[PDB]
């Protein structure tokens, strides 16, 4: 019991508040994530033992947590201690081997496949066919029993109506393609998720998956067992998505205070604005707009007929080569938690607006088709080379930008795929260099969808050129220095702040601001681009975003004036 | 003992709540043998038995069936059996993705897209068995007992089922997943098995969205080589009820109270105006368009046949060509939401994935037919809103002529010659060629021939009136303002007709009202044409006129078409011409 007693101290010390939370929320919340850093700080021997004999250590910790969870019902569910974050055994999926057998390993994983939920028995009950006795067994702690204890015949039959079940699942995992020097490996590591872990590793996610490597006798093409060759499978203990979509970002109580204090900074917006694309000089108006976009407009609005109104914003940059269009796109994609960067050029059936169709000879009955727009999941999809867009994509992006859906009527299925995303597109103009609206090669009906369209021109002011040059060198000098070994807001905080603002601030239009926007519209109508009612919605969106940028629940005329300002800047470049 | 008590509880509950329904089942047995039972009513009667449904569904469902048989004493249950089918609960509403071990042998209700359905497979319930060694007859219900494997008298494994002395009941396997509108990312690579028995069979057609309820079950999982896994199991739902929450116009149910309610609407002079104001609330203006959409929602008199036994189209087709930002998509989308099962689809297609796609015989495909069905084939009489009609593929362009006129798609391919049914009221919308809007007709890339098939073409233009801009601006701002205030539950400042009532009103008018032209109205249209003809106008305009006027009669639950209706058809027609001139 030494270990259990060891863990009792440990758990109480480092995770007492968390354990209390579990006591309240059990069985709905039933797992305790435990950093291994803490455990190695608390007993470096225990932590080292964990890596080489994890099953015995993990069992002890789970028993300790069950003890601290005193007075609760464990007839149906069992508490789980889920250790994560270690750096001793961090192999690549391709390099997992015999050295990690029955050892704890953490791997950077791309989830490729996920199976159906397959109920598995834990507290089992068996009946003897011959002598009718009932034998009980715990399949998570001993092997499936084989003989009746009274008549001694090998005749024990499982009775599932009297046994307990817990979820289980098989996933296929691979190395992220970003970590491979050459061609893709032709195999995937099998992994098993149990209980609450299930359906927490969707295909396409990148998760640090941790657990215990295990082996099993190999079965060949015919199912014939091996002479002495084994296959491998990892039993997962924890799952850490290091980088998390805004909605899944976890904000702590202390962090919640911290974010709120940031709100009171009267320059908070300009700090967010400066973190958009720090590597490039200038383009302050572009950045401001990208900053408004990150926060987005007020979500969850319905029209009188129940038609949901778009909050996400769309921005199209147009310019010549060397206009830092790719770099901005790529930088914004890195800032956002889950960001997509994709080129417009597509092969038919490999578009941005790709959606699954129905194939009876495919797994699940649906083809494995999904483009950037359906994988957006509310984030920013940075589409470079927007001019290269296919005709199929061009037509589908109308609905995708406006309604944030992709509707299909094919193979007897009527469906509307969900395509929420904030597009930051970039396009070079027709015939290379600029001469403004006419030379884009983007449809006028699709341009309408974008809220702000900022054309970028090269004024070639020499003083400006000298400033640019100065900046660029500086960066390089610095980078060089870093190899030699001689920020407005921190990134992590920045994301959390935005996540908080998107989750808990829903700006609502004041009368004064509504009236300012109305006046600007009508004035604009008086006397290249058609100024339809559409533009009014864009001004609402942007203004609402300014409010959400300061964590304010009401749109001011100050907000509306930032929106009208960015509009007018777009308009200045005729 | 406990089962007896349960039977009496159910007797009382069924007399109190479902007396009339049980009597209808007595009259029409076996053709009608299923009693839908809303759980909410069992909530009320004894909440404890309602919780026991979710926890021990099979015990109390078998009890309720037992009771319902008791209430149907005297009827012959040799072939068919009555069924109690519970629905409407909200305690266990899992997603198909997340269904799991917590619901094993428990009641669950799932929002489901049917994807596959199997062949009907007869299955034995009241089975007879005979022994090859001692000729002993063993009887058993196989839904309650397992299959006898060893003869009781002769004690050997020789039992043999006798199909000629056994009873049978239909069974069907269906495949189900979550609606794609509910998934957040990629489609799961799996889909849940469900089983339909007796009268539930062929009530889950591929493509339907049905709230499916039943008891989740487990079966031992088999390997790729048929070897059972040790403690690993597979899931499958034994469906006990199907509730279609959407319901197309014809399947919609109308209570007597509703009938009373609906009729009263009919007497108000401005019902049509009121309806016309329910079409696209979110948009401001577009009244003529709204009026037409309103007339399209009712349609002309169905069942008209020509002297030669042909069919006369009753459904109306509308096209809206306008500039970007002229609210085209929203109207299309709003109308699609209002109608029960509406399709909204883009005109852009790939070869073999068009609006007029139809099945093609193919032996290599499952079932001897390809999985091909577009919006027109799936229209089931609803409104099929096709945006970006200027991007229609040549193949679709050609097939839509016949689909719009004859409401059929005919084919002679793979040795099969047949005519698919494509009944639908299209509400198309297109942008002009070379972007922004001389002769309007030349401005858009649509064949003249295909344009002849629409009854109404509404061009939309910007008249740039400042006051109109002012008016619109106020209108939009007010809308948003209100929505934002609602998110916070503080109000600072209502369809003329409730949505459900409007749906049922239209459904009623479509079932029962069948307008017949009066000579008064007939003459006005009859004259109209000729005068219009003086100084591209064809005879089909008259047909459109008739349809629209008949629809104005149906809009007011009137069996006769008045001249007043004819005038309204003329006015819309007039508007189109005026607008289309130059
Ligand atoms: N303010 C700036 N304006 C323009 N270019 C800049 C600025 N700051 C840095 N650059 C340089 O511009 C180039 C980035 O352009 P990028 O988008 O990658 O190419 P392209 O625009 O043609 O796609 C880089 O050479 C970068 O160093
Ligand atoms: N009352 C109105 N009158 C005119 N236009 C409106 C009105 N209300 C909204 N709009 C705007 O008109 C747009 C409809 O898009 P749409 O015109 O269909 O584009 P396209 O013409 O390219 O299909 C919407 O984005 C909407 O914001
Ligand atoms: Zn025994
Ligand atoms: Zn026998």
Tab-separated table of N, CA and C in Angstrom, chain A residues 122-254:
chain	number	residue	atom	x	y	z
A	122	UNK	N	-16.544	-5.424	-18.217
A	122	UNK	CA	-15.607	-5.373	-17.100
A	122	UNK	C	-16.014	-6.297	-15.959
A	123	UNK	N	-17.156	-6.096	-15.334
A	123	UNK	CA	-17.532	-7.032	-14.295
A	123	UNK	C	-18.329	-8.074	-14.972
A	124	UNK	N	-17.750	-9.241	-15.125
A	124	UNK	CA	-18.393	-10.303	-15.839
A	124	UNK	C	-18.978	-11.397	-15.000
A	125	UNK	N	-20.025	-12.009	-15.511
A	125	UNK	CA	-20.677	-13.116	-14.865
A	125	UNK	C	-20.745	-14.273	-15.824
A	126	UNK	N	-20.346	-15.454	-15.372
A	126	UNK	CA	-20.344	-16.648	-16.248
A	126	UNK	C	-21.273	-17.710	-15.662
A	127	UNK	N	-21.878	-18.556	-16.501
A	127	UNK	CA	-22.728	-19.687	-16.014
A	127	UNK	C	-22.192	-20.987	-16.616
A	128	UNK	N	-22.075	-22.058	-15.853
A	128	UNK	CA	-21.595	-23.323	-16.329
A	128	UNK	C	-22.649	-24.008	-17.078
A	129	UNK	N	-22.360	-24.439	-18.283
A	129	UNK	CA	-23.341	-25.102	-19.044
A	129	UNK	C	-23.687	-26.366	-18.414
A	130	UNK	N	-22.703	-27.104	-17.954
A	130	UNK	CA	-22.954	-28.335	-17.261
A	130	UNK	C	-23.566	-28.330	-15.901
A	131	UNK	N	-23.101	-27.520	-14.937
A	131	UNK	CA	-23.603	-27.607	-13.565
A	131	UNK	C	-24.306	-26.377	-13.038
A	132	UNK	N	-24.539	-25.424	-13.927
A	132	UNK	CA	-25.261	-24.224	-13.612
A	132	UNK	C	-24.836	-23.332	-12.482
A	133	UNK	N	-23.575	-23.261	-12.188
A	133	UNK	CA	-23.121	-22.381	-11.170
A	133	UNK	C	-22.817	-21.033	-11.743
A	134	UNK	N	-22.824	-19.980	-10.975
A	134	UNK	CA	-22.493	-18.622	-11.460
A	134	UNK	C	-21.103	-18.251	-10.969
A	135	UNK	N	-20.194	-17.941	-11.888
A	135	UNK	CA	-18.876	-17.516	-11.523
A	135	UNK	C	-18.738	-16.088	-11.906
A	136	UNK	N	-18.151	-15.289	-11.049
A	136	UNK	CA	-17.989	-13.900	-11.357
A	136	UNK	C	-16.551	-13.619	-11.665
A	137	UNK	N	-16.293	-12.578	-12.440
A	137	UNK	CA	-14.922	-12.211	-12.768
A	137	UNK	C	-14.780	-10.797	-13.185
A	138	UNK	N	-13.640	-10.196	-12.962
A	138	UNK	CA	-13.373	-8.818	-13.364
A	138	UNK	C	-12.361	-8.867	-14.503
A	139	UNK	N	-12.810	-8.706	-15.738
A	139	UNK	CA	-11.974	-8.809	-16.901
A	139	UNK	C	-10.961	-7.746	-17.075
A	140	UNK	N	-11.046	-6.703	-16.304
A	140	UNK	CA	-10.007	-5.686	-16.305
A	140	UNK	C	-8.901	-5.976	-15.309
A	141	UNK	N	-9.077	-6.997	-14.467
A	141	UNK	CA	-8.083	-7.386	-13.483
A	141	UNK	C	-7.639	-8.866	-13.546
A	142	UNK	N	-8.350	-9.803	-14.155
A	142	UNK	CA	-7.923	-11.168	-14.303
A	142	UNK	C	-8.374	-11.659	-15.662
A	143	UNK	N	-7.921	-12.828	-16.061
A	143	UNK	CA	-8.284	-13.320	-17.368
A	143	UNK	C	-9.612	-13.984	-17.345
A	144	UNK	N	-10.174	-14.168	-18.524
A	144	UNK	CA	-11.453	-14.805	-18.654
A	144	UNK	C	-11.327	-16.175	-18.079
A	145	UNK	N	-12.160	-16.482	-17.101
A	145	UNK	CA	-12.219	-17.743	-16.385
A	145	UNK	C	-12.612	-18.846	-17.313
A	146	UNK	N	-12.142	-20.044	-17.013
A	146	UNK	CA	-12.388	-21.179	-17.873
A	146	UNK	C	-13.053	-22.432	-17.324
A	147	UNK	N	-13.050	-22.661	-16.018
A	147	UNK	CA	-13.638	-23.884	-15.513
A	147	UNK	C	-14.594	-23.607	-14.369
A	148	UNK	N	-15.638	-24.419	-14.255
A	148	UNK	CA	-16.574	-24.254	-13.168
A	148	UNK	C	-15.826	-24.696	-11.924
A	149	UNK	N	-16.022	-23.983	-10.806
A	149	UNK	CA	-15.321	-24.374	-9.578
A	149	UNK	C	-15.928	-25.591	-8.879
A	150	UNK	N	-17.136	-25.996	-9.262
A	150	UNK	CA	-17.779	-27.139	-8.622
A	150	UNK	C	-17.616	-28.466	-9.375
A	151	UNK	N	-17.863	-28.465	-10.683
A	151	UNK	CA	-17.761	-29.694	-11.477
A	151	UNK	C	-16.453	-29.839	-12.268
A	152	UNK	N	-15.626	-28.793	-12.246
A	152	UNK	CA	-14.314	-28.753	-12.915
A	152	UNK	C	-14.258	-28.980	-14.440
A	153	UNK	N	-15.356	-28.755	-15.157
A	153	UNK	CA	-15.336	-28.892	-16.634
A	153	UNK	C	-15.083	-27.522	-17.267
A	154	UNK	N	-14.457	-27.501	-18.443
A	154	UNK	CA	-14.159	-26.243	-19.126
A	154	UNK	C	-15.434	-25.788	-19.827
A	155	UNK	N	-16.403	-25.318	-19.083
A	155	UNK	CA	-17.679	-25.015	-19.626
A	155	UNK	C	-18.315	-23.730	-19.140
A	156	UNK	N	-17.567	-22.680	-18.967
A	156	UNK	CA	-18.129	-21.416	-18.427
A	156	UNK	C	-18.585	-20.522	-19.578
A	157	UNK	N	-19.863	-20.147	-19.593
A	157	UNK	CA	-20.415	-19.324	-20.646
A	157	UNK	C	-20.762	-17.945	-20.117
A	158	UNK	N	-20.389	-16.912	-20.848
A	158	UNK	CA	-20.642	-15.547	-20.458
A	158	UNK	C	-22.111	-15.189	-20.498
A	159	UNK	N	-22.556	-14.416	-19.528
A	159	UNK	CA	-23.913	-13.968	-19.451
A	159	UNK	C	-23.858	-12.473	-19.526
A	160	UNK	N	-24.052	-11.921	-20.706
A	160	UNK	CA	-23.918	-10.459	-20.854
A	160	UNK	C	-25.046	-9.667	-20.216
A	161	UNK	N	-26.211	-10.278	-19.993
A	161	UNK	CA	-27.323	-9.567	-19.374
A	161	UNK	C	-27.057	-9.250	-17.908
A	162	UNK	N	-26.067	-9.888	-17.331
A	162	UNK	CA	-25.747	-9.657	-15.959
A	162	UNK	C	-24.364	-9.110	-15.790
A	163	UNK	N	-23.766	-8.609	-16.847
A	163	UNK	CA	-22.440	-8.073	-16.716
A	163	UNK	C	-22.424	-6.615	-16.985
A	164	UNK	N	-21.342	-5.982	-16.611
A	164	UNK	CA	-21.176	-4.546	-16.799
A	164	UNK	C	-20.346	-4.278	-18.053
A	165	UNK	N	-20.551	-3.097	-18.639
A	165	UNK	CA	-19.926	-2.723	-19.902
A	165	UNK	C	-19.333	-1.323	-19.806
A	166	UNK	N	-18.280	-1.069	-20.584
A	166	UNK	CA	-17.652	0.242	-20.640
A	166	UNK	C	-17.204	0.437	-22.088
A	167	UNK	N	-17.317	1.657	-22.608
A	167	UNK	CA	-16.961	1.927	-23.999
A	167	UNK	C	-15.503	1.617	-24.361
A	168	UNK	N	-15.277	1.311	-25.632
A	168	UNK	CA	-13.964	1.029	-26.146
A	168	UNK	C	-13.874	1.378	-27.600
A	169	UNK	N	-12.692	1.682	-28.087
A	169	UNK	CA	-12.562	2.085	-29.481
A	169	UNK	C	-11.146	1.916	-30.044
A	170	UNK	N	-11.046	1.596	-31.334
A	170	UNK	CA	-9.755	1.506	-32.004
A	170	UNK	C	-9.535	2.740	-32.880
A	171	UNK	N	-8.374	3.386	-32.733
A	171	UNK	CA	-7.961	4.465	-33.624
A	171	UNK	C	-6.660	4.054	-34.310
A	172	UNK	N	-6.460	4.611	-35.504
A	172	UNK	CA	-5.226	4.476	-36.268
A	172	UNK	C	-4.485	5.803	-36.173
A	173	UNK	N	-3.173	5.740	-35.931
A	173	UNK	CA	-2.370	6.932	-35.685
A	173	UNK	C	-1.108	6.853	-36.527
A	174	UNK	N	-0.554	8.018	-36.835
A	174	UNK	CA	0.581	8.144	-37.728
A	174	UNK	C	1.381	9.353	-37.279
A	175	UNK	N	2.560	9.487	-37.819
A	175	UNK	CA	3.301	10.710	-37.568
A	175	UNK	C	2.667	11.860	-38.350
A	176	UNK	N	2.591	13.053	-37.760
A	176	UNK	CA	2.149	14.217	-38.534
A	176	UNK	C	3.015	14.357	-39.778
A	177	UNK	N	2.377	14.674	-40.906
A	177	UNK	CA	3.119	14.793	-42.156
A	177	UNK	C	4.140	15.923	-42.107
A	178	UNK	N	4.000	16.849	-41.157
A	178	UNK	CA	4.958	17.932	-40.985
A	178	UNK	C	6.275	17.463	-40.382
A	179	UNK	N	6.347	16.226	-39.890
A	179	UNK	CA	7.542	15.713	-39.229
A	179	UNK	C	8.286	14.679	-40.067
A	180	UNK	N	7.902	14.487	-41.326
A	180	UNK	CA	8.465	13.448	-42.179
A	180	UNK	C	9.353	14.075	-43.243
A	181	UNK	N	10.559	13.527	-43.391
A	181	UNK	CA	11.533	14.112	-44.302
A	181	UNK	C	11.172	13.835	-45.755
A	182	UNK	N	10.652	12.643	-46.043
A	182	UNK	CA	10.386	12.242	-47.410
A	182	UNK	C	8.994	11.686	-47.620
A	183	UNK	N	8.919	10.464	-48.140
A	183	UNK	CA	7.650	9.840	-48.472
A	183	UNK	C	6.952	9.319	-47.216
A	184	UNK	N	5.642	9.152	-47.335
A	184	UNK	CA	4.801	8.811	-46.182
A	184	UNK	C	5.038	7.359	-45.788
A	185	UNK	N	5.124	7.033	-44.497
A	185	UNK	CA	5.136	5.617	-44.104
A	185	UNK	C	3.834	4.921	-44.478
A	186	UNK	N	3.950	3.636	-44.819
A	186	UNK	CA	2.825	2.829	-45.274
A	186	UNK	C	2.192	2.024	-44.143
A	187	UNK	N	2.247	2.531	-42.914
A	187	UNK	CA	1.614	1.835	-41.803
A	187	UNK	C	1.255	2.823	-40.702
A	188	UNK	N	0.364	2.376	-39.819
A	188	UNK	CA	-0.215	3.192	-38.764
A	188	UNK	C	-0.186	2.374	-37.482
A	189	UNK	N	0.026	3.050	-36.363
A	189	UNK	CA	0.029	2.400	-35.065
A	189	UNK	C	-1.401	2.314	-34.550
A	190	UNK	N	-1.776	1.124	-34.089
A	190	UNK	CA	-3.078	0.890	-33.484
A	190	UNK	C	-3.100	1.427	-32.057
A	191	UNK	N	-4.221	2.037	-31.673
A	191	UNK	CA	-4.382	2.557	-30.321
A	191	UNK	C	-5.807	2.282	-29.860
A	192	UNK	N	-5.987	2.132	-28.546
A	192	UNK	CA	-7.278	1.755	-27.977
A	192	UNK	C	-7.703	2.780	-26.934
A	193	UNK	N	-8.904	3.306	-27.073
A	193	UNK	CA	-9.428	4.273	-26.147
A	193	UNK	C	-10.501	3.598	-25.356
A	194	UNK	N	-10.556	3.850	-24.059
A	194	UNK	CA	-11.534	3.210	-23.202
A	194	UNK	C	-12.296	4.228	-22.400
A	195	UNK	N	-13.550	3.941	-22.101
A	195	UNK	CA	-14.371	4.808	-21.265
A	195	UNK	C	-14.536	6.226	-21.769
A	196	UNK	N	-14.141	7.215	-20.987
A	196	UNK	CA	-14.291	8.601	-21.368
A	196	UNK	C	-13.357	9.115	-22.452
A	197	UNK	N	-12.312	8.367	-22.746
A	197	UNK	CA	-11.377	8.677	-23.802
A	197	UNK	C	-12.031	8.593	-25.165
A	198	UNK	N	-12.947	7.656	-25.324
A	198	UNK	CA	-13.682	7.407	-26.564
A	198	UNK	C	-14.240	8.646	-27.261
A	199	UNK	N	-14.139	8.684	-28.603
A	199	UNK	CA	-14.617	9.768	-29.459
A	199	UNK	C	-13.973	11.105	-29.112
A	200	UNK	N	-12.882	11.080	-28.351
A	200	UNK	CA	-12.102	12.273	-28.056
A	200	UNK	C	-10.895	12.429	-28.972
A	201	UNK	N	-10.696	11.504	-29.918
A	201	UNK	CA	-9.630	11.582	-30.921
A	201	UNK	C	-10.291	11.425	-32.291
A	202	UNK	N	-10.836	12.515	-32.831
A	202	UNK	CA	-11.436	12.481	-34.164
A	202	UNK	C	-10.355	12.408	-35.236
A	203	UNK	N	-10.619	11.709	-36.341
A	203	UNK	CA	-9.650	11.663	-37.441
A	203	UNK	C	-9.305	13.065	-37.918
A	204	UNK	N	-8.013	13.288	-38.144
A	204	UNK	CA	-7.494	14.574	-38.542
A	204	UNK	C	-6.917	15.403	-37.413
A	205	UNK	N	-7.283	15.111	-36.170
A	205	UNK	CA	-6.722	15.833	-35.041
A	205	UNK	C	-5.245	15.478	-34.862
A	206	UNK	N	-4.499	16.410	-34.266
A	206	UNK	CA	-3.118	16.178	-33.848
A	206	UNK	C	-3.088	16.248	-32.325
A	207	UNK	N	-2.810	15.114	-31.686
A	207	UNK	CA	-2.890	14.984	-30.236
A	207	UNK	C	-1.591	14.375	-29.728
A	208	UNK	N	-1.134	14.773	-28.561
A	208	UNK	CA	-0.059	14.141	-27.926
A	208	UNK	C	-0.761	13.024	-27.245
A	209	UNK	N	-0.582	11.802	-27.673
A	209	UNK	CA	-1.271	10.705	-27.111
A	209	UNK	C	-0.359	9.952	-26.252
A	210	UNK	N	-0.743	9.632	-25.045
A	210	UNK	CA	0.117	8.998	-24.134
A	210	UNK	C	-0.438	7.748	-23.633
A	211	UNK	N	0.388	6.773	-23.302
A	211	UNK	CA	-0.177	5.541	-22.830
A	211	UNK	C	0.867	4.485	-22.646
A	212	UNK	N	0.441	3.244	-22.777
A	212	UNK	CA	1.358	2.131	-22.565
A	212	UNK	C	1.415	1.304	-23.840
A	213	UNK	N	2.610	1.154	-24.402
A	213	UNK	CA	2.758	0.251	-25.531
A	213	UNK	C	2.566	-1.191	-25.071
A	214	UNK	N	1.926	-1.983	-25.925
A	214	UNK	CA	1.627	-3.373	-25.617
A	214	UNK	C	1.816	-4.192	-26.882
A	215	UNK	N	1.991	-5.499	-26.705
A	215	UNK	CA	2.197	-6.396	-27.831
A	215	UNK	C	1.159	-7.509	-27.783
A	216	UNK	N	1.056	-8.155	-28.917
A	216	UNK	CA	0.070	-9.154	-29.175
A	216	UNK	C	0.625	-10.049	-30.245
A	217	UNK	N	0.302	-11.326	-30.208
A	217	UNK	CA	0.844	-12.214	-31.220
A	217	UNK	C	0.337	-11.812	-32.569
A	218	UNK	N	1.144	-11.888	-33.603
A	218	UNK	CA	0.757	-11.409	-34.896
A	218	UNK	C	-0.044	-12.385	-35.664
A	219	UNK	N	-1.000	-11.956	-36.452
A	219	UNK	CA	-1.776	-12.853	-37.228
A	219	UNK	C	-1.477	-12.537	-38.646
A	220	UNK	N	-1.186	-13.515	-39.482
A	220	UNK	CA	-0.814	-13.283	-40.865
A	220	UNK	C	-1.999	-13.122	-41.822
A	221	UNK	N	-1.839	-13.160	-43.145
A	221	UNK	CA	-2.965	-13.020	-44.044
A	221	UNK	C	-4.057	-14.023	-43.818
A	222	UNK	N	-3.695	-15.256	-43.555
A	222	UNK	CA	-4.668	-16.267	-43.317
A	222	UNK	C	-5.134	-16.386	-41.880
A	223	UNK	N	-4.601	-15.598	-40.982
A	223	UNK	CA	-4.969	-15.659	-39.601
A	223	UNK	C	-4.127	-16.629	-38.844
A	224	UNK	N	-3.148	-17.222	-39.464
A	224	UNK	CA	-2.360	-18.184	-38.803
A	224	UNK	C	-1.449	-17.482	-37.850
A	225	UNK	N	-1.292	-17.965	-36.651
A	225	UNK	CA	-0.475	-17.301	-35.691
A	225	UNK	C	0.964	-17.465	-36.003
A	226	UNK	N	1.739	-16.601	-35.462
A	226	UNK	CA	3.148	-16.506	-35.684
A	226	UNK	C	4.033	-17.470	-34.906
A	227	UNK	N	5.289	-17.634	-35.355
A	227	UNK	CA	6.219	-18.457	-34.574
A	227	UNK	C	6.640	-17.671	-33.321
A	228	UNK	N	7.193	-16.466	-33.487
A	228	UNK	CA	7.566	-15.631	-32.348
A	228	UNK	C	7.522	-14.142	-32.684
A	229	UNK	N	6.649	-13.752	-33.590
A	229	UNK	CA	6.570	-12.375	-34.022
A	229	UNK	C	5.351	-11.680	-33.472
A	230	UNK	N	5.509	-10.485	-32.950
A	230	UNK	CA	4.383	-9.841	-32.330
A	230	UNK	C	3.985	-8.541	-32.962
A	231	UNK	N	2.727	-8.188	-32.844
A	231	UNK	CA	2.292	-6.906	-33.324
A	231	UNK	C	2.261	-5.950	-32.150
A	232	UNK	N	1.961	-4.710	-32.403
A	232	UNK	CA	1.975	-3.721	-31.339
A	232	UNK	C	0.649	-2.972	-31.301
A	233	UNK	N	0.325	-2.456	-30.113
A	233	UNK	CA	-0.843	-1.606	-29.926
A	233	UNK	C	-0.663	-0.792	-28.651
A	234	UNK	N	-1.039	0.461	-28.663
A	234	UNK	CA	-0.886	1.300	-27.536
A	234	UNK	C	-2.156	1.486	-26.797
A	235	UNK	N	-2.179	1.345	-25.488
A	235	UNK	CA	-3.371	1.550	-24.754
A	235	UNK	C	-3.302	2.917	-24.238
A	236	UNK	N	-4.170	3.796	-24.625
A	236	UNK	CA	-4.052	5.152	-24.271
A	236	UNK	C	-4.448	5.538	-22.894
A	237	UNK	N	-3.683	6.364	-22.207
A	237	UNK	CA	-4.049	6.869	-20.935
A	237	UNK	C	-4.470	8.279	-20.943
A	238	UNK	N	-3.935	9.114	-21.787
A	238	UNK	CA	-4.344	10.481	-21.807
A	238	UNK	C	-4.235	11.068	-23.137
A	239	UNK	N	-4.916	12.146	-23.356
A	239	UNK	CA	-4.890	12.796	-24.600
A	239	UNK	C	-4.721	14.269	-24.411
A	240	UNK	N	-3.657	14.869	-24.900
A	240	UNK	CA	-3.439	16.313	-24.760
A	240	UNK	C	-3.371	16.930	-26.158
A	241	UNK	N	-4.457	17.551	-26.614
A	241	UNK	CA	-4.379	18.466	-27.758
A	241	UNK	C	-3.613	19.709	-27.319
A	242	UNK	N	-2.317	19.811	-27.701
A	242	UNK	CA	-1.523	20.953	-27.246
A	242	UNK	C	-2.162	22.263	-27.688
A	243	UNK	N	-2.516	22.375	-28.975
A	243	UNK	CA	-3.123	23.580	-29.544
A	243	UNK	C	-4.610	23.331	-29.777
A	244	UNK	N	-5.463	24.217	-29.256
A	244	UNK	CA	-6.889	23.927	-29.157
A	244	UNK	C	-7.727	25.029	-29.784
A	245	UNK	N	-8.745	24.633	-30.551
A	245	UNK	CA	-9.679	25.595	-31.126
A	245	UNK	C	-10.209	26.525	-30.040
A	246	UNK	N	-10.561	27.756	-30.435
A	246	UNK	CA	-10.931	28.770	-29.448
A	246	UNK	C	-11.995	28.256	-28.481
A	247	UNK	N	-13.008	27.554	-29.002
A	247	UNK	CA	-14.117	27.109	-28.163
A	247	UNK	C	-13.684	26.053	-27.156
A	248	UNK	N	-12.678	25.251	-27.489
A	248	UNK	CA	-12.169	24.245	-26.573
A	248	UNK	C	-11.028	24.752	-25.705
A	249	UNK	N	-10.564	25.988	-25.910
A	249	UNK	CA	-9.516	26.523	-25.048
A	249	UNK	C	-10.017	26.562	-23.615
A	250	UNK	N	-9.180	26.117	-22.690
A	250	UNK	CA	-9.519	26.106	-21.273
A	250	UNK	C	-8.953	27.355	-20.602
A	251	UNK	N	-9.865	28.145	-20.032
A	251	UNK	CA	-9.469	29.371	-19.288
A	251	UNK	C	-9.623	29.083	-17.792
A	252	UNK	N	-8.569	29.305	-17.002
A	252	UNK	CA	-8.601	29.082	-15.573
A	252	UNK	C	-9.271	30.227	-14.886
A	253	UNK	N	-9.573	30.043	-13.616
A	253	UNK	CA	-10.189	31.089	-12.839
A	253	UNK	C	-9.255	32.265	-12.754
A	254	UNK	N	-7.987	32.003	-12.499
A	254	UNK	CA	-7.015	33.069	-12.413
A	254	UNK	C	-6.860	33.752	-13.740
